[PDB]
Amino acid sequence: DIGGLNPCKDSEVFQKRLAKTVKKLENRLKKYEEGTPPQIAIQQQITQTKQRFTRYADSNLLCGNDGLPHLITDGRWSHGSEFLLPSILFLYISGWIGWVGRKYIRTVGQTSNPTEKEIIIDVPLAISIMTSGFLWPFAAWQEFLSGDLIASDETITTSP
């Protein structure tokens, strides 16, 4: 399909990889005894390996000639769960972190001892700001509009 890849559900090398891993795990399982915790752990390993391979097969995942899932990150929504949705999730979380950090910096920057409140965090104010970051996309595009997001010329510059 895309880039010459093929779905992993029809990739023979993918099933060969699964079979080889399961065979190695079973051979390891053979050298232990009865329902002893080592055998239980190896059986859990086998079950998890089978579940992971089955989930990857039924996941709209494209496999190359090596039988490994390749990620299609050109931007198409068909393979949108590989990069685009995790990209949105990370952008949300990281914007949350950056927004709460910036808000805390600007909030304790207007107190008597701004530097003290950076090594000794005001946990009440920190908790107040941190749970308010869920609106960071909206807060950012409400502070940029008001001109409160960017400094203009009070920023320092070197000699040249």
Residues that bind other proteins (CB under 8 A): 31-33, 36, 38, 41, 44-45, 48, 51-52, 55-56, 59, 61, 69, 81-82, 85-86, 89, 101-102, 105-106, 108-109, 114-116, 118-123, 149-151, 155-158
The CA distances from residue 145 to 21, 32, 135, 155, in Å, are: 57, 68, 15, 20
Contact 125, 107 (CB under 8 A): yes
Contact 9, 57 (CB under 8 A): yes
To other proteins, the closest distance from the beta carbon of 64 in angstroms equals: 15
To other proteins, the closest distance from the beta carbon of 55 in angstroms equals: 7
To other proteins, the closest distance from the beta carbon of 94 in angstroms equals: 14
Q: Judged by CB, which is closer to other proteins: 14, or 82? A: 82
**Tokens (6 digits) for 92:** 């949300």
